[PDB]
Assembly symmetry: C2
Homo-oligomer: 81 residues x 2
């Protein structure tokens, strides 16, 4: 019924070990790239009675499982199938 | 009080995207390595009344949060501080 997509990205100012690791590795391989960042996208279908219930529920999953709002900025898009 | 360490590794036969990614990258950089694997270790202190409670609790955390026993083999070591 509902196609959900959650995008998770560390807030500005927050250290990104992977981003820093990739950037340095690239520099060493001879590639000059700046402002390297990483986003994690979780997609998944869900059955519900309404778009409203999916919203409050997905929001719950993000708060207690998918990410740490303290350090992560997240996006949630719900597309009805 | 208790120093806990949880080691998590995919069961034999299970695809390891990272392990496969690292191995191929290395081969390309000129390094011939075989049987590449990865282990995730989570360590953390915890206050308790007993070593027994920590054991049943840590076991719970692994079952519903730290890993997927279906595809992961895990180790749990508890050292009293």
């Amino acid at each position: 019924k509902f196609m959900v997509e959650v995008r998770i990205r560390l807030k500005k100012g927050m250290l990104n070990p992977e981003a820093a690791t990739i950037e340095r590795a690239l520099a060493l391989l001879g590639y000059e790239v700046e402002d390297t960042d990483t986003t994690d996208v979780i997609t998944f279908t869900m059955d519900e009675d309404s778009l409203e219930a999916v919203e409050r529920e997905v929001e719950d999953m993000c708060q207690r499982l998918l990410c740490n709002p303290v350090i992560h900025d997240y996006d949630v898009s719900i597309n009805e199938m």
